[PDB]
Amino acid sequence: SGFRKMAFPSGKVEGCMVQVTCGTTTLNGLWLDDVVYCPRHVICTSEDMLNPNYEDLLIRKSNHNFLVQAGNVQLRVIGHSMQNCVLKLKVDTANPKTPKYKFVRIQPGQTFSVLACYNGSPSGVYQCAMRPNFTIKGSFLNGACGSVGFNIDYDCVSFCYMHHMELPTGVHAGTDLEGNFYGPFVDRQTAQAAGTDTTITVNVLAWLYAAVINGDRWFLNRFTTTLNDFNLVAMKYNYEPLTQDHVDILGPLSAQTGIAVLDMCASLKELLQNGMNGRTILGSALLEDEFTPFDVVRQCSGVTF
Amino acid sequence: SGFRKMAFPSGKVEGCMVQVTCGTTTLNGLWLDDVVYCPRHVICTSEDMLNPNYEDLLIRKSNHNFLVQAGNVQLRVIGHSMQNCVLKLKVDTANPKTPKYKFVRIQPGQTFSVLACYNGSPSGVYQCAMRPNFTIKGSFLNGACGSVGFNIDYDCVSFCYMHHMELPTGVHAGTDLEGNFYGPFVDRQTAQAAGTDTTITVNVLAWLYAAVINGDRWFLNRFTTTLNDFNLVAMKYNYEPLTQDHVDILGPLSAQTGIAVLDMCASLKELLQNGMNGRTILGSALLEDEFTPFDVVRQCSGVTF
Ligand SMILES: *C(=N)[C@H](C[C@@H]1CCNC1=O)NC(=O)[C@@H]1[C@@H]2[C@H](CN1C(=O)[C@@H](NC(=O)C(F)(F)F)C(C)(C)C)C2(C)C
Numbered sequence A, B: 001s002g003f004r005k006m007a008f009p010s011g012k013v014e015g016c017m018v019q020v021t022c023g024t025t026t027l028n029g030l031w032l033d034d035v036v037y038c039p040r041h042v043i044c045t046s047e048d049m050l051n052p053n054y055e056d057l058l059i060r061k062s063n064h065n066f067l068v069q070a071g072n073v074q075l076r077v078i079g080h081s082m083q084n085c086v087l088k089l090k091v092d093t094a095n096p097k098t099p100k101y102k103f104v105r106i107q108p109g110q111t112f113s114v115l116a117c118y119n120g121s122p123s124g125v126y127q128c129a130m131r132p133n134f135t136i137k138g139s140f141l142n143g144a145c146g147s148v149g150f151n152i153d154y155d156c157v158s159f160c161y162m163h164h165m166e167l168p169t170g171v172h173a174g175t176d177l178e179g180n181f182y183g184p185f186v187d188r189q190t191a192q193a194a195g196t197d198t199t200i201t202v203n204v205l206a207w208l209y210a211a212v213i214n215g216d217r218w219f220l221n222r223f224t225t226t227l228n229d230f231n232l233v234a235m236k237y238n239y240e241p242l243t244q245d246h247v248d249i250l251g252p253l254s255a256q257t258g259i260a261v262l263d264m265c266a267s268l269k270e271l272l273q274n275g276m277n278g279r280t281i282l283g284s285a286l287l288e289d290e291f292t293p294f295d296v297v298r299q300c301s302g303v304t305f
């Protein structure tokens, strides 16, 4: 029993982290086979980053201008291209610790682990949701850029995030590993704000199922609702619409606990209308939306890698 | 910016995890050099665990009775002893992935990362506090026993916890790596409950400093208090006494923010007496006590391993 915010084990990703230095800018890179992927703004100075021309700054760099270090071993760059907002540095050495991997673009609502790195050295690991406004609620200092987010499925690491920047209110924005931003953000230092966020309804339901499984049951009411009736009340409290795909994805938790998704919807509608009256669920005084149905099943049925 | 529950990177510990099978019982072991450490109740059946005689059950085991697997490689046991509640199995192979390590017994109030493992395979990593009642608030299913808790200091893994059991209310109990229980718990299936818990005052203060650093400042009042006056109000809300050692440990955060520890004490006393009036701190509607002063500095100043 017990329910925790739980990251994937980071060992497979730790063996891929390197330091990339260009001019005086240092940040993190991801070394897979004979390629190092990092944020393209490594080729900028302070001045540059207000409104940089990246294609221009890159024309003017040799292979030798990029210093890539894995521990106190220097990798020799033998090639450099740009793909959207990501730099690819071909190196003379294939990373012998390359795991089985894929590059994935996740949807809003999906969780992943961040390995927070400084100078190519891992600082910590924590779990994050891609918010509907295409931000994450991370913990990143100066030098954290090139830190990656990932999922693990048995042996395969799916990389879905690379860290680029911090927005007002200390939320974070970044790219897939093909260098395309999540959301409408750009890699320059200008006025950018997140759209207002919404609550990921399917994740709150997944969390309510985790509470039931762990014996926290006080909020269960004796009522049902229609999907339509639920989605009208959800809308007022800035909750995402719940789709039929969402209902089908909650099937396993529903079948495990014997509570129909629309019965849990009735329970959530009451918590939204009446609040929690100073009571907690799984130790929390707020409804939690950063656990997916898959994360609840993992943790509550003990899936390993 | 941002403040997250953040685990240590688990790679160094992942390379030490093995599966231990004795009879039909399987659980996790920690393989360091040529020794595998696991919970001694691996030598029990269901029946045994109500009131087992461990010295007796062990007399009757050969080296060959212990099946130790690291992936799909079997390690040959060549020696077996018991140290308190932990089994030591000498094996024929030194673990080539053994990190620099120490065995440490932590004090109540201290945090660590748990690597939750099933069948010798890592499931997830999360951060935990040793509670004043000598429990942790973990997430452990059947087969999680032998899962370890650790801290990392640059290159050195300090192992401080091995998981043994779950107590009523789904809190967890275990040993140091010398096999001595934290708290008054025993490794048998009987009536055992945790003492009532208390709030780790020094950790709540560390967290309030993290809030200030992240720009969450609404709860700062214009008042000071005496240590004596603070500890009287703390006592009513089931908060630990704050000692002078606690004040000295908070010095760095105090000097960084320019708020005297006794000024933050005045701010916490007001939150305890008046509550939060429906406001949040670092996203939380409850005061958090599972970040140490060291954890706050790590995260807010970017320490790596
Ligand atoms: C890479 N190491 C940093 C990581 C940042 C620094 C503070 N915390 C983080 O997560 N990335 C940057 O410094 C990027 C970089 C230029 C500006 N920048 C920002 O994150 C800035 N943000 C913005 O300009 C805004 F508002 F658009 F989000 C900053 C003001 C420094 C927080 C580039 C190329 C985007």
Ligand SMILES: *C(=N)[C@H](C[C@@H]1CCNC1=O)NC(=O)[C@@H]1[C@@H]2[C@H](CN1C(=O)[C@@H](NC(=O)C(F)(F)F)C(C)(C)C)C2(C)C
Pocket: A001, B027, B041, B049, B140, B141, B142, B143, B144, B145, B146, B164, B165, B166, B167, B168, B172, B186, B187, B188, B189, B190, B191, B192
């Ligand atoms: C080892 N894999 C398990 C881990 C447990 C199982 C459920 N979640 C966990 O964290 N350890 C045990 O099964 C230990 C084991 C016998 C009983 N046990 C317990 O944790 C039991 N607890 C207690 O008897 C009590 F109340 F004292 F805590 C159980 C009722 C199964 C939860 C031994 C040797 C202690």
Ligand SMILES: [Cl-]
Pocket: A283, A284, A285, A286, B283, B284, B285, B286
């Ligand atoms: Cl909360």
